[model samples]
Target chain A: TKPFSIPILTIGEMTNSRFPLPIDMLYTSPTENLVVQPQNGRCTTEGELLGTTQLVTPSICSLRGAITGHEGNDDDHKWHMTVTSPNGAAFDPTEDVPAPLGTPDFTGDIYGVLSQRDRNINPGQTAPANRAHEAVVSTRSNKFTPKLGSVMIATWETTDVLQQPTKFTPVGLESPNHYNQWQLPNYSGALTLNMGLAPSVFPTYPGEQILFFRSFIPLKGGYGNSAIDCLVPQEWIQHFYQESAPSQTDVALIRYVNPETGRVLFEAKLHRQGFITVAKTGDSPINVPANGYFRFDSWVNPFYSLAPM
Target chain B: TKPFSIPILTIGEMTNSRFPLPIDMLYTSPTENLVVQPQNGRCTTEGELLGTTQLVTPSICSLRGAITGHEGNDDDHKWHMTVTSPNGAAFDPTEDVPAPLGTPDFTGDIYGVLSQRDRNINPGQTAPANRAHEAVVSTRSNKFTPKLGSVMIATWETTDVLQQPTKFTPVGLESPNHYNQWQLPNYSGALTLNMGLAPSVFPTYPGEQILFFRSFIPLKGGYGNSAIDCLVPQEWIQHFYQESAPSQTDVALIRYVNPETGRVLFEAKLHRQGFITVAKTGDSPINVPANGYFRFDSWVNPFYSLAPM
Candidate 1:
């Protein structure tokens, strides 16, 4: 199967007041007339490259661009750019006053001016014009003088968009980043997706699908729910919908089983009406006991045909 | 003011079926009799350190501990530990059978066994016992062997907890991480805090405070809202609550101003009753025009006392 690809372009303003010149109007664009060239197991962009340069400065605006491509599968495909004014510039005395001697230096790049103004203004004191007003810049990258702004434009030929990854890997409880961990609360129905997992890879087999299965199991005080957002092979789902004998009523079943004993902890049937039945009416719900771990199992009416006859 | 310090301890199980032995029960603990020693402008912990060790192994459990301290203030104070079974172990033949020759290896540490089981199980096939069951471990850190589990415990002295930072720095739009950047939609009243900012530093003064100021301003089609969760010095808030003359009414005011023209884009009065009044009943609401940026200004009723008499 082919990997997915997409063109991404983001533009925004970058500003830091503490610099000699503050605002940076930034944007990213693809290389003009670039074609993907595969050579020696690597993909390269064929075009007149506009290498990283400070296109404009004292009031400087800079631009940087790069093209990256991977061989075999087009998985490592990317073109990125960064635009900014002069970075790490010292405070200029003529245009902006020096902060008080003991004042700490601003460390951040995007919003230095706000911190600069906040640091120097005393309680109940009126802000000075130099500190309150935005610094003006005429030219780009000069040390102390202003410069005029100039315009530069580039264009690119668009190509067909590639299919992006559609299969997402399930995040388990052991993830280092707590944000990606599957949360199964002890006694709550709330299944919170602090940040849902993103699709990381393309589907492997044709017609293979993914489904989100949620099961609410009875606990001592309240019911605890567990959910699995996982991939189910096409054959497993299709097994239930296929033509069956007159005496058979085929049903799709999913179970959470204890690996050690092969015992089903909680079982559910996926009905044709598109709803899960964890426990039938008048049947007592099974509970997941203790701190034991379980794994998933999918079947299509095991009583009818264990091997899907 | 001293920097904040806090002791954090997290305990959890790490498991991977792909490993020769799975399941690591881990916990962290402090060092015994450890005292903070200042040496040449650095703080050091004085004690017999357990120092990273695999306390037990085939079903290996490991332990690691560290102490960190900074000079001047307690800003860098930290004591951390990690407990786990053996990491990065290859599959063993005696304890568990190897997968069919073409099966791919599991890459994750936390839940390797799950993926391992999933990879080897064929569609509509019953899982073999070794592939389904958890691997047993008896000993510690030996190559391709089973060993018995041993117990090791340590003790530590309790100390007073240091004050943690209570002042949070406001996250601005220029932050590189989208999670930390402020969001201001063109026409929306829904102010979302995807993840609220954590306090980064201790208060610089005795009575400095932080306040969340939200402003709803009229826009072209609807209303646009802006919020500033920033530090407000004690003097600024106190200035409004002071005793005043019989004919005077003191009010705290905050303004969002255009830095270039020094024009107030939006202003709010903080009434003594704790409600913000942005626009009076008879006044037409002011709108923030175009793509211009603005900065914040806090003032105590300028008419009564510009210098806070």
Candidate 2:
């Protein structure tokens, strides 16, 4: 639950060059909140709002009709063009590198989703009250190059919603970041997201949050979701880079399966880091890519080792 | 799914004072593998077996049929006790604060459970193959003062156990740590523990591990499980000391309900940190305690206010 008593006001940050979006676009306009641009559109100004007809359609709007196609009222509230602090608070341009709006909720545990294709952008949406207990799943089928994107979603809930109250924890947001892809790895061509999942074990421990898995969909017909890729918590990404490359030929596709059926969730090609456009089979997922960008050697459980002892 | 391929070699440390157990006992015996001692007895030397008459009674012991309780065994290869270094190798104590046994495995993710009364003692038991998927839940109805213990169970599985295996991330473990007790502010005789159940969200993020709510089972007859407490991850323990403290007269207990009928799972009492303890009224099998080592200050979701606005 997002506790206000334990307010965490900052965030772990990377620099402009590290961000997925163009540094120019992110800093192009300083003061305004910049929503995601439509796949086929552009944002020439700073405060301009960006939304696709597919992602945030009216049917998905909040209780009071909080959002519209582009000029939604909460656009600034949901997305941002600048950052305030590495602590991930709202932007304060006066600082060396302005911070993006951190996930600070005054009401319920509101979460902010940050996606990166060419830029680190926010989904600019919130869950409706009815969906409080449910996840705020976002799908992107953007027709842009790399065409796919990465995401970081965050939220915090208040623990003492009922009963006598005492002691609340802070506004800490769980940020699962650093997933970049061009094709939806699963059949649905989309991925589901939430701050964190409760351990499947019963009578779950307090604050015993588990880093749930996210998947990719690969349907020939799946475009919008196709442009979407899969994701895991940021820890794993850091892990791949820090540790020796994971062991496998196709880390991404291997992850796109149905846990119960053992069936492939999706089928597609592989293209990451330097090993661009390699077939999912026969090719090595851990190949030192031809491109100097970040590449995945293979996908291994962040907690367990697959390497033989 | 706890992948051995990826191993965690480091830990977030706090002072020995902060731990529920005394730092003395923990570090005092550096090289020996210590196990939980019997509640009705004492443990002086290392490797002496510790089994409950009700909990872990061996089917047939090496020298004798030691225990006369419910049956259970090593759940799997996932949970472990001896930790390794950042290199995922075993300990090299020569290093300053040489790392503790990490969740390193050559085959699968192995987790270790630690309980605190005086030392962050490991149960020092591993599950046999038959019970790998089953939980290694530990209970203590020890005759010792403050008479309860905390347990940390770890495991990783293929999603196919419930669904399919299209996706498999590396194995991971969630560690539940120790909690101290205090006098119940009100009521006849009771105590308070740090365990608070958090909200169950879906599609969790990586390392966005939640501090699951720990439970305090108050029974008319149950002792080992009695005055028992719930716990959160170690992070929040540090959080409370730093932040201004949580909010209100009390927090929420919306957590204690059966998923199907939505009935209260356990009937108990309440006492806010600033107030006194009150008994749970009506219609429940669970009862108020005659003993008073561990009490609650009302159940608050362990999230929120910890993060800043």
Candidate 3:
């Protein structure tokens, strides 16, 4: 149900879907964001994880075999998602800073947006450029002509309890408590773009909210690449909003033309980014960039996530 | 009657109304633009001075003089519009950079977009970044958040058809002669950072079909300071059915996050930036970092024709 302008996210159709979309908060698009622990927003979940964030709204989690199967609630389902750039500059990795720092637009076929040619394909997918990450989730150009609109916002849920073990869960688990950490509350509409276009359509956005990020759920914060499940459909994915920091606000007016002599070519004005608040995890965070923020829910094979029965 | 999230164009209601409110398009948020461009974006008649270009849809123009009035036409008028963005090499007519190039995130303020400290205070009103220039007609920021959006689109519409004067009455007739040199239509919306949060919001849109420029306009990309504005409006600028040569599909999207461990975030799907056909113009056409493309648009504000208003 979310796919316009592309925002890529699908840890596997929110795991499997049945009735569990679970996401606390996230907002990335017309602004900046990266959540896993702040959705204290309306304050609830015990004032959202012990309260104290003000409007709060940030916090997310995943990893329990990466959860799968929604509704029946199997941790809701978590796979992967990451996109960073806030002017982005973290420095201080020392000894040869490496692991995940620069060059990463979209991996996992880009669901949020990217594919025209593969947005230069970063995320290690290598020289993929365009496709805004591969047409972000794919409906195909929609017939072109100023056509764009993709959504991928998600928040942490399970009401988030925290702490766990089992699979290789890492991210400062402290000597490796293992995996499954949780620790995030209100989050909504996180964004990522190696490619994107429509901040306009998508089932008209149902209930009227939808922002996007829980691309099925991989924990979106500082991973490499992994999140491809834009199967779309689920009350339109709950209107796609739960928002913690998502933004886009597009209408249209672009530039670059020279159809022979269409004169008046070259012009620009499209910079919408400003949303910060997630910092304190492993701290290796320079701001998501590494051609490897994967997560496709399951069933694999080019972004799954189907529902319509 | 719109001015909150932007509704087509609005800013009227001095409570009752008075003529004292004649600031037209000053800057830092003065307000007005809804699509100006009457004939050739206006220069002072004389056949618009020679150079021409049309396809209007972008109102309000009056920051240069802080807020005067003379270029009007749509009846109660105002449209002078001017912009430049030649960053780095090229742009040394006695040294002076930053003009719709960088340093903007809502500081000091003048109107809406044009930061990086206001493109370094004028940069000679802009128009030197290699030659072809113009931008600043009014109504700043549209969309582009690749760390800030990158600038210098510099579309076109020079006008110089005076047809008179023994000297500059249009430079003795034959004048500038530039007609419709298009490619400055921005659907503005894509690329978002600081305006929100995270790795500059994981922003990095070079995708495809970016038409090549206006990935969101400025925010970063002039010489490397920063500037942003790209939410969308101006009637989606005409959608670009095709551009020829470097053509691709997909669309736009570049949202980011990671202020501090919201657990992590993801959203990278961008293939924005596609459009080139200058053969030769007035400004620094190509030659940045060797040139793959830069100069989004800077012929100076002039777009207003939502199907003829």
Candidate 4:
């Protein structure tokens, strides 16, 4: 769990809170009625598409909608990135931050991966057609000093209402602020996460979203086939002091681990969970850091955490 | 570890903070010499001795010195207590509320079990001597609506230094109140208690020290040897709506299953770890039941729990 919900959302905050990601962005509707990142609204090199204090660095290309089809839970999306800079250096004009697109002002890059597979909601349950769980164990591992990069794992899933229909309570209920509230504001359980090994990926941004997909190697050796870590780190955490320090919201770290063994299979420490002090109404800009920063360093239990994506 | 040193002292104020049994008082120390429960202190009656609000109410005993003639590493001395009311009910002059003795007023009782077998420092660790680990699980069937009667299991083990060395950072730590500050705390993992199996007993109370012991059984295959419910009716926790609730200091419902024949051997709900608040002077006494009508409770963990009889 990466986002802590209580401190961020109160009933009073109707507009300033992290809401769930809309489901219709996939463009599966007939008659081309649905579209995501429409081509007519594409941003040119001359102007920015999304306005904010920080930059909206997209690592993937965008195309329009209409006659669409998804591979459906087959586990096929995947990608990787490397750390480029430290925390303050993300926009430090003095450090000579590199901008691959020739803009010296834009310092970091965005990269993501995808996955498709037949997932079991409950331990043993049937999965309906036209539906599958999708997750993007994304990362923002930047090339920063002291390398204080963070991780962002985005997930979109369908509920298994068979066994639990009336009152369904999954784990991590105490935590509140995520883009999605598929459960509720009071669900608190240490929900388990499955990372199918191969947790070794080098040079990642501090807060980039590392996508998840099918495992290249069969996790059949030590244990039967299991999920693998999207990206592991060289020295994941960026904390330096041992004494009392600040609970900085500008930076954070979220980790994933094997519950049975308590070994940190993966970590995601965000240099920052961005919030938009400024944005437009029609833009629908749902991409940014969360309300919480400074999370786990390594080998953390997935369910016992706070925050979604 | 009976007392891990994360320096978490929680004097639970019964002022509307959600809980099964509202905390009225709390104290902590590091040594047995520091443990105290002065004589002439009132107490509860035996036979009827049990938790009033929890499932397995623990009987905490204050000591006057280190335990003698046993087989464990207990190097503590000193102790004290105020009153002891058995049958779990706190003496109240509410007129309508009848005391455990069913009289205008009642004196508390005392009798404890102590063991010299081992220093209970951690879970699944070996005891000092040939003695097995201790425990006291409790169960009470027939009550549809939950009363305050709860079941809680606690332990007294050894510890090192406190991480922060103050009564603040109490996560992942378990220590005694007014016992020995130098010693550490144990990991009191939460056990889910099902209250349908008629509870039996191994009574303990405040001011009555327990040295070493384990189990209070009556189960399948006859005698129910390795006792399961190491608790009293006064430690039951109910706020575990979600399985992944914050375990830092809340009651936990443990989910255990047997591998043979796909059977579920047993399941228990363990109370959350709490911080022991201690003062350097030893003169400080936490206010029990802010209204003065309720008395503080004290019980021993019958499961892996023992005392000087």
Best by DockQ: 2
DockQ of each: 0.01, 0.02, 0.01, 0.01
Model 3: residues with Cα > 4 Å off, grouped in runs: A1-309, B1-235, B238-309
For candidate 2, the share of real interface contacts preserved is 0.00
- Measured over the true interface residues after superposition, the C-alpha RMSD of each candidate is 27.0, 22.7, 24.3, 22.6
TM-score of each: 0.17, 0.20, 0.17, 0.19
Off by over 4 Å in 4: A1-252, A261-266, A270-295, A298-309, B1-7, B12-309
Model 4, residue B147: C-alpha shift (Å): 17
Question: Please, what are the lDDT tens digits per residue for candidate 1 over residues B3-51?
Answer: 1111111000111111111111211112122221100011111111111
lDDT of 3 by residue, A1-309 (tens): 222221122222121111112221222231113222221111211111111111100001111111122223233322222222111122231212111111111122111111112113345443322101101111111111111111121223223311211111111111111122122211121231112211211212112111233322222112221222112212122222212223224221123233345433222221121111121222221222212122111111112222210
| Model 3 chain B lowest lDDT segment of ten | B165-174
Candidate-wise lDDT, in order: 0.19, 0.18, 0.18, 0.19
Alpha-carbon runs more than 4 Å astray in model 2 = A1-230, A244-309, B1-309
**Model 1, residue A10: displacement in angstroms?**
42
Q: Is the docking of candidate 4 incorrect, acceptable, medium or high quality?
A: incorrect
lDDT of 1 by residue, A159-200 (tens): 211121010011111111121112211110123211111112
**Chain A TM-scores, all candidates?**
0.18, 0.20, 0.15, 0.17
